Amino acid sequence: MQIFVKTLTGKTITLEVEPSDTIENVKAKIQDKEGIPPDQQRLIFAGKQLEDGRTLSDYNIQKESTLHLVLRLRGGMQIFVKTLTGKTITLEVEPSDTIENVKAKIQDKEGIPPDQQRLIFAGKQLEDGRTLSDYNIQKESTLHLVLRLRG
């Protein structure tokens, strides 16, 4: 049977599968088509993240069903960055990322140059050359962003 996998970039991948295929099997088929390692793949169906050891039938995935694929860094984690101007943003980072790297990521989402970002965690201002690991910043930690505005 055929199932479809939608990606966030807008493309759709068509796969030939059996109801007995494992999620692991499905990820390997996606790798065959797209070259993406299974460990970077998250598959979503019925609002749930699919587990590698279960089968399509376990999730009631039937012919012509659509799954959603989201790519994530192996060994990555999410952190939250609370601003003082309204928004809390969500970032994917790695423990080995330097504070400089994280500021680069905030610039991508929020458009603020690193030089104007002051990041604070557990009451301490973070230094650019240190890593998230150095500050023991863990998954789902919340950092605070203060903007340096001129004038």
Partner: protein, 58 residues
Amino acid sequence: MPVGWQCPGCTFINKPTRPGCEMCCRARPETYQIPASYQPDEEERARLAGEEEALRQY
């Protein structure tokens, strides 16, 4: 059926209290409301307690 907010981007159903999508990082929808009865899993419960404690001075 998980209870929470559906991410309109990837369709993952997120914990009511999460600020952005656990899968794709997209922001939580503006008008979604927390359940009347929300009992978060132990990990999210500890996360929320930590954030409250950080706002408090005693």
